[PDB]
Structure 1
């Protein structure tokens, strides 16, 4: 038996706040950070830069932390970054089987589905089928590599650049690198 969750959550707040343990504006600040600052638009910027700047691509793949820090996008749950490179024979996909671990500042907070028991149980064992079910067919001639986010490394996928995007601007390329592309479950799509 439980009280409504909203009542429990605000009870926790009120208990702490009424003891002076929560600074003025504190949760509201974090809400703003979570909603407005932590965002997969930042990861998309990083990917579009790597696609258009071979020197930055090299940096991002060798010292992801340093690459991210250049844009000022290090942050909570995103202090030690590794970017993982898709290739014509390799598709990478990220999970946190134990909870929800995600590179928050550059991917945004994880979506409900990524935290689901279904994704947490299944993608480590049957990633091809899970991606297929989700709408992503990985050609049978491609290795899938699942990264389980079990410690402090926080990952982002550097997807392959699709054909039909040659010469696009960084802004144009950013638009097709979605949250799901950064997690690794989607491949960037070019309109016709």
Structure 2
């Protein structure tokens, strides 16, 4: 009849898993609490933003970022779980890059942050590989006809970040000013950095 299986409340199930393992001495003291802290506080799109702003103002670093993303990121100490082999992909006047994991949710956690709910949605996972222009449009990003859209499907161990184009009107801005306009969505590739009116 296609009905859902009977299930205890998810909170009760998740905590049961914790207690079953913790009760057997298999979880070190403060272990999950420490990961929670890392996930919430250390893994952050602010790091990706910093990298972009540096690339934007430092031709030498921009070249390193685009050729050996891992090395570039390591200089900041931002390698980590789900972010050990990094490739940065460069937007151009004729190319817009976008990242997905169609098979699950794979994301460069340490520099982009853990994926947002929408990135993990079946909608995004199913649609962006096939109709990225329509998907970005619906999300509020219009990509013109003269621009190739390239979708990177994160199917293995490469962990991607988009290096967006630096918008006009930011000439002479400091690294801190530039960082501010590079958001999580710019790093995933669904948004273009915005300069205020």
CA RMSD between the two structures: 0.2
Matched, 1:18 2:23: yes
Question: Which residue number corresponds to residue 139 of structure 2?
Answer: 134
Instruction: Give the count of matched residue pairs.
Output: 192
Q: Which one of 31, 40, 43 corresponds to residue 38 of structure 1? A: 43
Shift of residue 139, structure 1, vs aligned partner: 1.0
Please give the secondary structure, in 1, of the residue aligned with 2:194: coil
Shift of residue 8, structure 1, vs aligned partner: 0.2
1:71-129 residue CA offsets vs partner (Å, 9 max, x unmatched): 00000000000000000000000000000000000000000000000000000000000
Please give the secondary structure, in 2, of the residue aligned with 1:147: strand
1:145-183 residue CA offsets vs partner (Å, 9 max, x unmatched): 000000000000000000000000000000000000000
TM-score, normalised relative to structure 1: 1.00
Shift of residue 57, structure 1, vs aligned partner: 0.1
* Mapped partners of 1:12, 1:59: distance in 2: 43
Please give the secondary structure, in 2, of the residue aligned with 1:31: helix
* Mapped partners of 1:22, 1:168: distance in 2: 47
* Mapped partners of 2:10, 2:183: distance in 1: 32
* Mapped partners of 1:92, 1:79: distance in 2: 21
* Mapped partners of 2:121, 2:144: distance in 1: 26
Q: Which runs of 4+ in 1 moved over 6 A?
A: none
* Mapped partners of 1:132, 1:7: distance in 2: 40
Shift of residue 140, structure 1, vs aligned partner: 1.0
